[PDB]
Design a protein around this ligand. Sequence first.
Ligand SMILES: O=S([O-])[O-]
Ligand SMILES: [Cs+]
Ligand SMILES: [Cs+]
Ligand SMILES: [Cs+]
Ligand SMILES: [Cs+]
Ligand SMILES: [Cs+]
Ligand SMILES: [Cs+]
Ligand SMILES: [Cs+]
Ligand SMILES: [Cs+]
Ligand SMILES: [Cs+]
Ligand SMILES: [Cs+]
Length: 138
Amino acid sequence: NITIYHNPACGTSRNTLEMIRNSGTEPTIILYLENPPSRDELVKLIADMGISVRALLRKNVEPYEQLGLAEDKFTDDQLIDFMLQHPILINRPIVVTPLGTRLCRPSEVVLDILQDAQKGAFTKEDGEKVVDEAGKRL
Ligand SMILES: O=S([O-])[O-]
Ligand SMILES: [Cs+]
Ligand SMILES: [Cs+]
Ligand SMILES: [Cs+]
Ligand SMILES: [Cs+]
Ligand SMILES: [Cs+]
Ligand SMILES: [Cs+]
Ligand SMILES: [Cs+]
Ligand SMILES: [Cs+]
Ligand SMILES: [Cs+]
Ligand SMILES: [Cs+]
């Protein structure tokens, strides 16, 4: 039972999805840009991820820029409501498994919450080796 909030245009997100698969599970895939979490869900995801609201914000996207989110002038709930109204602000990928929830940045964070070991060596799409055939992280 695994869920990934996925952006196919994002290599971090692609690598994460493939590591999930390499553990032998096909996750439920949520295209968050189209189908963002509800407020309650988003609030829960953030709590489980154990990072701050601001740490989930993606920089370098149009609403972050134009809404001036770089500046320290926003409460956590203000920031939550911006994420819900402008889903590209939600950084990615977020992964939920029975073990926990993580913002998988870098992608190999997902290894922490996958219950089953990688079934063989994993190499990122740019060639960065993550685990060898024997399962050791490099
Ligand atoms: O793809 S950017 O968020 O690092
Ligand atoms: Cs699932
Ligand atoms: Cs499985
Ligand atoms: Cs939803
Ligand atoms: Cs960018
Ligand atoms: Cs836009
Ligand atoms: Cs736009
Ligand atoms: Cs500004
Ligand atoms: Cs693990
Ligand atoms: Cs292995
Ligand atoms: Cs990269």
